[PDB]
């Protein structure tokens, strides 16, 4: 699940200092999850990725977004379909955008199911002021659930 | 009127540069679990950057349970990076 509602008083006291965010839908949201990998590079099946995917789809719907979904895409498919999503005319009449990417990754890049990498800088560029004029000056949220290396953090004791 | 090439984005990362993000095979990833918990409860009265701080607080306290493996008692730290230029409130359910 439940998204607690904003009060009218809260909106009245905060709308002047915030991004404009009142459109219906609030924005388009894209949830892209890769769980099953089949390239030359062995990448482990992402058990529990199913739970993440449905949690975000539910969350973003409940927050008033029109949710688009993609599952198990190659690096090339991800770039193409993200670019297509960024280019949708529907962004012209919404106030914001959400993109969530869930996969295996390395520093600065995420894996497609083919074990090839898409650079995250190229992903953000698709939505930037140059390439995505429909989203200029509108808030764009990205959530990236992927490893950024293979160092495990053993933690430290509190001193 | 001119804009920088990139602005008004906030990006939440499950882990820090060089490190692993953690996922429970049953409950899903630590970061997504925390994100949904916080946003569902607090989107009503907290802006997105401030909610991602609450997510960070939840992640910092979590610890890996996976005895006999590399990950037992492991830690994670999430982060966010922001080019936002004002508060981002999602105003859920307004106007009624």
């Amino acid at each position: 699940m439940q998204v607690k509602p904003c009060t009218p008083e809260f909106y009245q006291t905060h709308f002047q200092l915030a991004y404009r965010l009142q459109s219906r839908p609030r924005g388009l949201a894209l949830v892209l999850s890769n769980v099953h990998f089949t390239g030359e590079k062995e990448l482990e099946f992402r058990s529990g990725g199913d739970v993440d995917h449905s949690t975000l789809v539910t969350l973003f719907k409940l927050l008033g977004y029109d949710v688009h979904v993609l599952c198990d895409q190659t690096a090339q498919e991800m770039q193409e379909k993200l670019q297509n999503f960024a280019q949708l005319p529907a962004h012209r009449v919404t106030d914001s955008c959400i993109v969530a990417l869930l996969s295996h990754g390395v520093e600065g890049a995420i894996y497609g199911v083919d074990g090839k990498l898409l650079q995250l800088q190229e992903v953000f560029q698709l939505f930037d002021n140059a390439n995505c004029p429909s989203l200029q000056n509108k808030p764009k949220m990205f959530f990236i659930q992927a490893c950024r290396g293979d160092e495990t953090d053993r933690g430290v004791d509190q001193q | 009127m001119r804009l920088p090439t990139r602005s008004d984005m906030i990006c939440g990362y499950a882990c820090l540069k060089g490190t692993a993000a953690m996922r429970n095979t049953k409950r899903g990833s630590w970061y997504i679990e925390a994100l949904a918990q916080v946003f569902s409860e607090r989107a009503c009265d907290m802006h997105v950057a401030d909610m991602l701080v609450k997510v960070n607080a939840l992640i910092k306290d979590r610890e890996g349970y996976a005895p006999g493996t590399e990950f037992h008692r492991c830690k994670e730290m999430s982060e966010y990076c922001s080019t936002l230029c004002r508060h981002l409130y999602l105003f859920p359910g307004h106007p009624p």
Binding site: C147 | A14, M22, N24, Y65
Partner: peptide, 4 residues
């Protein structure tokens, strides 16, 4: 718990 496992790594992504």
């Amino acid at each position: 718990d496992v790594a992504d």
